Structure formats: C-alpha cells, structure tokens
Design a protein around this ligand. Structure first.
Ligand SMILES: [Mg+2]
Ligand SMILES: [Mg+2]
Length: 249
C-alpha cells in the first residue's frame, strides 16, 4: 500500500520541465537505459515521454525512497523500419542525492520476425547516478547506510552497509529478498576512486561461504550521505541482478 503510493509523480515526471528547486535528486541522466541509436518511450498515469541517450529524467517530480514504475518500449530504426527491441517496466529508486534504475524486460523482438514481439523476461540494473562523492573529498570517520535491495519481481529486499572512511573499507548485507540465495554478503572491499575520480566500492558477493558474483557501490552527496549501485549473484546456472541503494539515517 505504502510502496504503491507514488502520488502523481509519474505523469508529472513525464510532462514537466526540470526545476532545480524541486525535491532532490532533481534529475538523472539516462545513458545505460537507452543507447545512442535507440529511443526509449516511458509511459504512466496517462502520459508518455520519449527519451534518447543523454536525456534527463525528471526525478524531481518523483517520490523519495520509493520505486517509481513506468511502462517502457525500446525502439530502433533498422532497414527502413521502426523496431521494438524490448518492452517492459522501468523501475527507478529515488534518494536525495542519487537514483538507480532497473529494467524488467517482458518482451523482445522475435529474432526471426523483427517487427513482432515474443515473451522473454530478464532483469538488469541500468542507470546509476546523482551527485557523486569525489574521492578526494571524502568525509571523515564512518557511516552506516540503510535502504532497499530490489530484484526481478521483488522490491522488498533491504540493504545494510558500513563504510569506514578512515580505513577506506566497506562491507554489508542484502537481506529479506524472497529468493534466499539473493541475500548475499557484500564482502569487505576497498573504497577507491574510479575513472572520473568518484568514490566507489567494487567487491565480491558471497553466499554459502563462496563468491557468487560482484557488487558495485558508488557514494553520493557532499558527505557521502548515500550509496547506490548493483550486485550480481549466481544461483544455480543463472546470474541474478539486484538494484541496491541506501542512505545514512
Ligand atoms: Mg534530448
Ligand atoms: Mg565528477
């Protein structure tokens, strides 16, 4: 009930201009969710907007600490035809300094009939952004983060994570997902700078006392108020992706 209470933010995000006085995070650049030859149509609450690579999503209009959901289609022009490559649901979790996007795919183009769709489900974490914390401007001390872990058909996992800025080390946990084996250790890993000199943590996921995949957490906010990113976990023969985001209380 509370999770489903997203106000009128979906229609508003699709139809309103960026207003930097709106509640932060005010916008997210869409880069991973739509590639340069593609277009992404998001629809909800009676509205629709077309996005291309590099376009801004107006997260300022969306509810904080909730997953906002949009129906999407992904299209491309190929050989004189407008082809739908994917259709599904675009899920975005909004915080004060950060946002993370996951895509639940429902249909893809038929590989043998490109202008028709077939059912084929998958789930991936795509865009991740906000006010990145500069690695050279990290806060002092330590911090604990609480928030959401969301995977395919399961938005009710929890994230708990601890960073010691002085030791430049982080570790944490994914809890409460319905699939037991998704509730991985986010094993201790080094806090370091990425290519853009942003503070990030790249670590292993573990379950059953073995490595099962990797996780990526980026720090956001001038005091690293928040973290957001993704985790992968291999369960049987399949790799599962999990969106994760949290904030200091
Ligand atoms: Mg544009
Ligand atoms: Mg930067």
């Amino acid at each position: 009930r509370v999770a489903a209470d997203i106000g009128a933010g979906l229609a508003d995000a699709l139809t309103a201009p960026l207003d930097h006085k709106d509640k932060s995070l005010q916008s997210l650049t869409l880069d991973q969710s739509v590639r340069k030859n593609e277009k992404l149509k998001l629809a909800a609450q009676g509205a629709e907007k077309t996005y291309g690579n590099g376009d801004s999503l107006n997260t300022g209009k969306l509810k904080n600490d909730k997953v906002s959901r949009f129906d999407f289609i992904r299209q491309i022009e190929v050989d004189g035809q407008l082809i739908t490559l994917e259709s599904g649901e675009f899920q975005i979790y909004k915080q004060d300094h950060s946002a993370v996007v996951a895509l639940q795919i429902e249909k893809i183009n038929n590989p043998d009939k490109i202008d028709s769709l077939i059912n084929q489900r998958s789930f991936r974490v795509s865009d991740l952004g906000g006010e990145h914390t500069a690695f050279n401007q990290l806060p002092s001390g330590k911090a604990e983060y609480h928030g959401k872990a969301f995977s395919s058909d399961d938005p009710n996992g929890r994230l708990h994570y601890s960073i010691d800025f002085t030791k430049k080390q982080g570790y944490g946990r994914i809890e409460h997902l319905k699939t037991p084996e998704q509730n991985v250790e986010l094993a201790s890993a080094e806090l370091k700078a990425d290519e853009k000199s942003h503070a990030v943590i790249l670590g292993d996921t573990r379950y059953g006392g073995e490595e099962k995949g990797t996780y990526h957490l980026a720090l956001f906010g001038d005091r690293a108020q928040e973290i957001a990113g993704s985790a992968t976990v291999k369960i049987r023969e399949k790799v599962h992706e999990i969106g994760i985001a949290g904030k200091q209380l």
